[PDB]
């Protein structure tokens, strides 16, 4: 909880500090404004007519001369709209891709938990929170990142009693002197037992198997019951 | 003392992973991190 | 990615004439708008190559002792004998795609194109740098499994990583350790068949050669439209200016300008539509890098036809190859 | 069989007290009453 609360704190600090964090949204707003401005600026262009201003052509020339000048403004102006609408159709396809990605991240990172590596942030995904933005969405991806590693010696199997043992879940490790099972993603060592492990084949086939004891939690029950059993006999003598 | 430099870019920090046929690294701790991602909609 | 191209719209339309350039100005911002569009495509080719290959902030390297439990990566790992650190399989791919105009210092089809104002820009990441990122992704995989994707690279023995893989496809890890010498021989033989395949056929890289071919064909079509009259008394701008005085020349030069400008607007439209296809393919390749190389995927048929174990990236001219390893 | 153990009760916020059944125990005790019947007869 303190790590999560501190990491949410760093988001507010980041967004208060930099301008470039929302560049992917500002670029879209900028391209819309730039494309609209370019289309307005093409009203200034003559396209070879004696003026770029339609009313001047109509003020200065009579119909059969005016038609030849006005057709140059129409032709150039048309091509300017056909360009704008083509650029906007190609931008609409990019924004639509991005929206299909954002809808997929909404469904798989907010409404769920994702096993897809690096789809919901750099880490193992826990959950994500959506936030609205102008023309966009922000996802706050919450991720478990493994932090302070230690080296250990390891083995693919333990050989106990002519038979090879493998972890049910987790991995075998030793600190040098003793052997444990731990879960793969967090060091939490447990004694090697018939509950922590399963058996397959003799010890001869596994490359790199190691000899260690394999605890049976039925056995000290059966033996503590054998000392109760002995005390009943010894008293009843 | 400021000026424009030009250089061949580095692709990252240099890092040999300490591999051996019987060595494993396991994390004793974790960081919960929150990272923004921004999409045009 | 595809080849970064830019065009001097004035040198293409009016090449070295002042009296044509004064008519081209009457068309307003159209030349600038084309230059912008081509720059937006050209920057996106680095964005794409960066999103696909730069998925690690550290450059990992394989250990000098290659004890991977019998698995043999020497045909996908680097080769220090080569003047670029490219691997054996990558240096096949660099022979199969027959490139055109890498823009590396001009001093033929390429010379014809450049001399009409059609320049080709360098990529930001040279083929050594893509090979280093690819080497780092591979060295992370064969020494650290998925963990270098999630956080710190954590070493694990390669046979134990393959066991974690087998558990990821619902096959119990003892099925690896009881068959490891076979599983290694099958993997080594399957990597052998990749070198044989790439040595044998030409069509295997068709998806990359088609991109190089369309870039070359689109550049050639744009050069060929300099031959066209568009209704002017000649297609050669200097002849019009040599034969006619200003008020007649303006009527002929305007037909060449109008036709040429439509030829650039066509080229830039085709290239924007190709940039969106390559853009998609690069987002797919970046997703396959993240989910098949930096991880193991439960997504059926996303990382090859089979149950996915792991994948190895290899660089190719304008592309990426994935060698997907699958349990069948 | 349905559960696994980790640490003492002091660290988990919101832990509750309840019995945790051991399916070895009534076997061991039904065997202790067989064991008692063998002794009591053999008196
Ligand atoms: C590898 O991990 C082992 C398990 O944690 C560890 O062995 C344990 O070491 C502690 C001491 O640090 C022992 O504690 C006992 O020490 C004496 C015994 O007479 C008493 O004063 C104490 O009260 C206590 O009983 C543990 O008994 C011992 N566990 C076992 C199973 O032997 C190793 O030290 C670790 N090795 C390395 C290289 O770090
Ligand atoms: C893991 O534990 C195994 C069981 O203790 C152990 O196997 C034993 O290895 C020794 C040495 O090879 C054998 O000793 C006998 O070897 C031959 C006869 O087979 C004789 O020439 C010798 O004089 C001696 O009598 C044991 O018979 C053998 N036992 C079994 C059941 O295989 C492994 O060697 C241990 N491995 C490690 C790495 O600790
Ligand atoms: C796992 O990593 C945690 C950090 O992400 C770490 O928490 C940190 O613990 C240390 C103490 O071990 C704290 O250091 C401060 O401790 C006291 C004040 O509380 C002072 O005497 C010290 O000078 C120092 O200021 C950190 O502040 C604390 N950080 C957080 C976010 O809680 C855990 O302890 C690590 N756990 C394990 C088992 O490794
Ligand atoms: C990993 O796989 C490599 C590729 O198969 C393998 O390299 C190959 O090694 C053999 C054995 O030396 C070579 O066979 C040739 O060896 C010499 C060459 O002068 C000749 O006397 C022989 O007749 C034969 O032609 C292969 O040519 C060689 N291939 C390559 C591409 O180098 C490695 O040895 C394997 N590594 C391990 C640890 O198994
Ligand atoms: C869950 O079960 C626990 C075990 O029965 C129980 O702990 C017990 O709590 C009581 C009340 O605090 C303690 O009673 C003693 O407390 C102090 C001495 O420590 C004295 O002042 C009192 O007079 C009294 O003797 C028990 O000692 C304590 N036992 C243990 C092993 O901790 C929990 O309180 C139960 N919790 C719930 C929510 O049910
Ligand atoms: C994990 O261990 C490696 C090196 O292996 C160890 O080498 C011995 C000195 C001893 O410690 C043995 O138990 C191991 O077999 C560490 O890699 C070294 O890191 C230091 C910097 O910290 C560097 O100067 C060395 O050159 C590195 N050596 C190699 C071969 O890479 C590694 O850092 C250890 N992991 C952690 C988390 O500390
Ligand atoms: C591990 O490598 C060493 C050499 O460094 C070798 O002696 C040993 O037999 C190998 N063990 C396994 C299980 O591969
Ligand atoms: C010993 O046996 C007698 C019955 O003969 C019984 O009453 C007594 O409780 C027993 N004590 C112990 C310690 O077993
Ligand atoms: C749950 O909330 C109540 C108040 O409504 C509080 O008394 C109780 O201690 C809380 N329990 C836990 C486990 O947080
Ligand atoms: C009692 O013990 C005798 C042997 O002394 C045996 O024959 C008989 O079957 C036993 N009966 C019971 C109920 O244990």
Residue numbers in the entry:
A (entry chain B): 924 to 1160
B (entry chain B): 689 to 729
C (entry chain A): 730 to 836, 848 to 1068
D (entry chain C): 1118 to 1160
What text appears in the publication on this structure?
SARS-CoV-2 is an enveloped, positive-stranded RNA virus that enters a host cell by fusing its lipid bilayer with the target cell membrane. The fusion reaction is facilitated by the virus-encoded trimeric spike (S) protein after it binds to the host angiotensin converting enzyme 2 (ACE2). S1 contains four domains: NTD (N-terminal domain), RBD (receptor-binding domain), and two CTDs (C-terminal domains), protecting the central helical bundle structure of the prefusion S2. The RBD can adopt either a ‘down’ conformation for a receptor-inaccessible state, or an ‘up’ conformation for a receptor-accessible state; movement of the RBD allows the virus to protect the critical receptor-binding site from host immune responses.
The Delta variant (also known as lineage B.1.617.2) was first detected in India and was quickly characterized as a VOC and has since outcompeted other variants to become a globally dominant strain within several months. The Delta spike protein fused membranes more efficiently at low levels of the cellular receptor ACE2, and its pseudotyped viruses infected target cells substantially more rapidly than all other variants tested, possibly at least partly accounting for its heightened transmissibility. SDS-PAGE analysis showed that the Delta trimer peak primarily contained the cleaved S1-S2 complex with a cleavage level very similar to that of the G614 and Beta S proteins, indicating that P681R has little effect on the furin cleavage. 3D classification gave three distinct classes each for both the Delta and Kappa trimers, representing one closed prefusion conformation and two one-RBD-up conformations, respectively. For the Delta and Kappa variants, the FPPR and 630 loop configurations are largely consistent with the distribution in the G614 trimer; all are structured in the RBD-down conformation, whereas only one FPPR and 630-loop pair is ordered in the one-RBD-up conformations. The furin cleavage site (residues 682 to 685) at the S1-S2 boundary, including the P681R substitution, was not visible in these maps. There are no major structural rearrangements in the Delta RBD with two mutations, L452R and T478K. Neither binding nor neutralization of the Delta variant by most anti-RBD antibodies tested here have changed, suggesting that the two residues are also not in any major neutralizing epitopes. No obvious structural alterations were observed from the D950N substitution in HR1 (heptad repeat 1) of S2, with multiple pairs of charged residues in the vicinity that could stabilize the packing between S2 protomers in the prefusion conformation.
